[PDB]
């Protein structure tokens, strides 16, 4: 299948490119701006990791992030899956964006921590781009941190701790009934100076791990942490 | 329990009939039109198969489809469960409709294909009826196709391929943040001539199977394909 | 972690207190009323049992229920998880509320009945308090019953039977596409005299157990029934 670019067991994430999408279909897609060439990154488990991976693909190419959608998923876990549509005019440039996103999954899963009772997710970049902006509300060109815990109360405490660690600016706070697809996540997003943003993410991680462990299992990442 | 009609392991689907529903309850239900007699079809796994099954029940009776509701479910898969309420004036007719729907499950699951990573669902009819109209936006009395893939990006490619196969008319495209219960499905619905519709659905199936297989498992239907 | 109060394996429920929440965060929380001190009760499986357990924490303390939020969860089952935020002036009062809620989970899971196909949930109190009000629409100071079945069509029948058992007043009926987080639950809430309310909850339980058991498995509670 010419549309197939690659598929990864990480999050059950598949990447595809439609070189010239049918106009009647395009007309029904909820995109910020229409383009003839579309890349598609679609996964069962994760939204932050795939969104941050796609941000590297946008930085590497001329593609634009035109839709981020939010399945309530993770195959029985508390989180989201994800659908990301990017738009451009060159199928080659789309394929390269999708390949770069797929080759960043092992990194952006590095601070996802899982346990039987729930999970934590952390993300950080010193310079957000268009996927982080559309998907997570990041301010493009500026530092960005994502601090998430499930069950969602843990995220509320992670958020409080992170804000009290350095003078970072809160962007939003999403929760089961506001700004998620009824996930069981409490997620603070932040901006500010890159060092402080990193400080605040790491503080939220530490208290998240302590809280989630209280169910009796050390939360585990399947790939090495990238936030340090 | 007089209200029980039957239960199937297929989708964990249960059918019941309330011959004369309490009016205080009926004023709390979101129905297109109130009737005193309700048929209820309720499942954990599947929305399209039950909807198309109930379409046969409507064709077979005088019952009207008055509500289709959408649990996000499939017991940890990426799809929907379903609540279908039908209404009429005769408890026996409501029961016959529910029986006909239960008896069509093995058929309407025939183009549901499952794998660890996801699933595909295809439906087709040459003449849609009231449940397909209310539930899925079909045009009654005309041909209808549903072409769905999970994770949802597979469904976007399935749909592009379907439209490029024959001149069909798209009805809608639903996706995780538009027109689903935050499901992981991308679903194209179409009408047009019955032959062109069947062509489009079959080509969507083919590319979806190829795409979903890339996770390393052949997608399996548990019942013979009907399309 | 000073914020930690307790964690239970019942529902995967964790209880925490923030003595002095950051004001920038509080401004982003969806609460009915700002308080400096927050108690947080959060779980993967259950909403009604945590809300009813928090009602007893409220009755025991000066805390007010200021937010109830609704994960679609139960770890692949058909129900909700829950996030409950309580607010007050005194971190010790918040801790006592959370402890009382945690110590009520074994009781409020008493009439939660699970099976492979679905589950039932019943609740009862002769006097609802603020968590049952904000969370479930109960009338404060009056008896309250909750009658819920999954898959959701079982809840419609349970609710019909309940109303026809005694003269009770329906407050709401929530369903997959109305008033839930796309759960697969049909849930009737009622008020009225306490004896009539218990009669109705119990009759709803009986018919639900019979219907859910048609899938082949007796629905089981993990804790003694309290109703």
Q: Where are the domains of chain B?
A: 1-227
Which of A14, A21, A83 is facing B175, going by the closest CB pair?
A83
Which tokens in the block code for residue C6? Answer: 């307790």
Q: Of A175, A125, A171, A120, give the one whose Cα is nearest residue A148.
A: A120
Query: Is the CB of residue A47 less than 8 Å from the CB of residue A70?
Result: yes
Give the whole-angstrom CA distance, residue B214 versus residue A7.
7
Beta carbons of B70 and C176 less than 8 Å apart = yes
DSSP C36: S
- C-alpha pair distances (Å), C223 with each of B105, C107, C109, C110, C205: 36, 7, 6, 5, 15
Task: Say which residues have a Cβ less than 8 Å from residue A106's Cβ, sequence separation at least 6.
Answer: A10, A223
Q: Tell me, in Å, the resolution of the deposited structure.
A: 1.6
Phi, psi torsion values for C143, nearest 5 degrees: -70, 160
Q: Of C128, C146, C134, C155, give the one whose Cα is nearest residue C200.
A: C146
Q: Of B35, B41, B90, B26, give the one whose Cα is nearest residue B61.
A: B90
Which tokens in the block code for residue A118? Answer: 């729930």
Identify how the structure was determined: X-ray
Give the whole-angstrom CA distance, residue B70 versus residue B46.
10
Q: Of A36, A37, A26, give the one whose Cα is nearest residue A94.
A: A37
Give the whole-angstrom CA distance, residue A163 versus residue A170.
8
Pairing of strands B4-8, B13-18: antiparallel
Q: Is the peptide bond before B139 cis (omega within 30 degrees of 0)?
A: no
Give the residues across from A29 on adjacent strands: none
DSSP result, B200-219? HHHHHHHHHHHHHHTTSS--
Give the whole-angstrom CA distance, residue A17 versus residue A40.
6
Give the residues across from A138 on adjacent strands: none
Query: Is the CB of residue C100 less than 8 Å from the CB of residue C62?
Result: no
Which of A21, A38, A83 is facing B152, going by the closest CB pair?
A83
Strand ordering across the sheet containing A186-191: A112-114, A119-125, A144-150, A186-191, A169-174
3 state SS for B119-172: EEEEEEECCECHHHHHHHCCCECCCEEEEEEECHHHHHHHHHHHHCCCCCEEEE
Burial (CB < 10 A; 0-12, 13-18, 19+), residue A223, is middle
Query: Is the CB of residue C55 less than 8 Å from the CB of residue A138?
Result: no
Give the whole-angstrom CA distance, residue C64 versus residue C32.
10
Beta carbons of C28 and A157 less than 8 Å apart = no
Helix (H, G, I), strand (E, B) or coil at A81: coil
CA angle (C68, C72, C73) in 5-degree steps: 110
Q: Of B143, C29, C12, give the one whose Cα is nearest residue A157.
A: C29
Which tokens in the block code for residue B181? Answer: 């219960």
Give the whole-angstrom CA distance, residue C27 versus residue A173.
10
Give the whole-angstrom CA distance, residue C174 versus residue C114.
20
Helix (H, G, I), strand (E, B) or coil at B174: strand
Mutation target for C interface from A45, A119, A150, A160: give the one with most C CBs within 10 A: A160
Query: Is the CB of residue A198 less than 8 Å from the CB of residue A124?
Result: yes
Q: How many CB atoms lie within 10 A of CB A14?
A: 28
Give the distance from residue C47's alpha carbon to the nearest chain A alpha carbon, in angstroms: 12
- What is the residue whose two structure tokens read 């009934």? A177
Q: Is the peptide bond before A151 cis (omega within 30 degrees of 0)?
A: yes
Query: Is the CB of residue A130 less than 8 Å from the CB of residue A35?
Result: no
Which of A117, A157, A160 is facing C12, going by the closest CB pair?
A117
Burial (CB < 10 A; 0-12, 13-18, 19+), residue C195, is exposed
Beta carbons of B44 and C117 less than 8 Å apart = yes
Give the distance from residue B46's alpha carbon to the nearest chain C alpha carbon, in angstroms: 12
Helix (H, G, I), strand (E, B) or coil at C115: coil
Task: Say which residues have a Cβ less than 8 Å from residue B65's Cβ, sequence separation at least 6.
Answer: B32, B54, B58, B84, B85, B86, B130, B131, B133, B134, B135
- C-alpha pair distances (Å), A96 with each of A17, A61, A90: 10, 7, 10
Beta carbons of A215 and C182 less than 8 Å apart = no
Up-side HSE of residue A27: CA atoms within 13 Å toward CB? 8
Q: How many residues does chain A have?
A: 228
Query: Is the CB of residue C191 less than 8 Å from the CB of residue C143?
Result: yes
Task: Say which residues have a Cβ less than 8 Å from residue C12's Cβ, sequence separation at least 6.
Answer: A116, A117, A118, A151, A215, C43, C44, C45, C75
């Amino acid at each position: 299948v010419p549309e197939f670019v690659g598929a990864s067991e990480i999050g059950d994430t598949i990447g595809m490119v439609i070189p010239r999408v049918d106009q009647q279909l395009l007309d029904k897609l909820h995109v910020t701006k229409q383009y003839k060439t579309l890349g598609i990154l679609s996964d069962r488990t994760g939204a932050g990791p795939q969104i941050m991976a796609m941000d590297e693909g946008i930085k590497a190419t001329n593609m634009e992030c035109i839709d981020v959608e939010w399945p309530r998923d993770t195959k029985g876990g508390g989180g989201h899956g994800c659908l990301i549509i990017i738009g451009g005019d060159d199928p080659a440039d789309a394929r390269q964006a999708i390949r770069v996103a797929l080759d960043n999954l092992h990194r952006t899963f590095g601070d996802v921590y899982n346990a039987k009772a729930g999970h934590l997710e952390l993300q950080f970049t010193a310079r957000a781009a268009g996927a982080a902006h559309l998907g997570l509300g990041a301010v493009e060109g500026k530092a960005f941190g994502l601090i998430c815990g499930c069950p969602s109360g843990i995220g509320v405490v992670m958020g409080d701790k992170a804000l009290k660690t350095a003078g970072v600016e809160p962007l939003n706070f999403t929760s089961p009934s506001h700004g998620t697809s009824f996930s069981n996540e409490g997620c603070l997003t932040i901006t500010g100076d890159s060092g402080a943003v990193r400080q605040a993410v790491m503080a939220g991680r530490e208290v998240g791990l302590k809280l989630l462990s209280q169910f009796g299992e050390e939360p585990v990442n399947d790939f090495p942490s990238y936030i340090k």
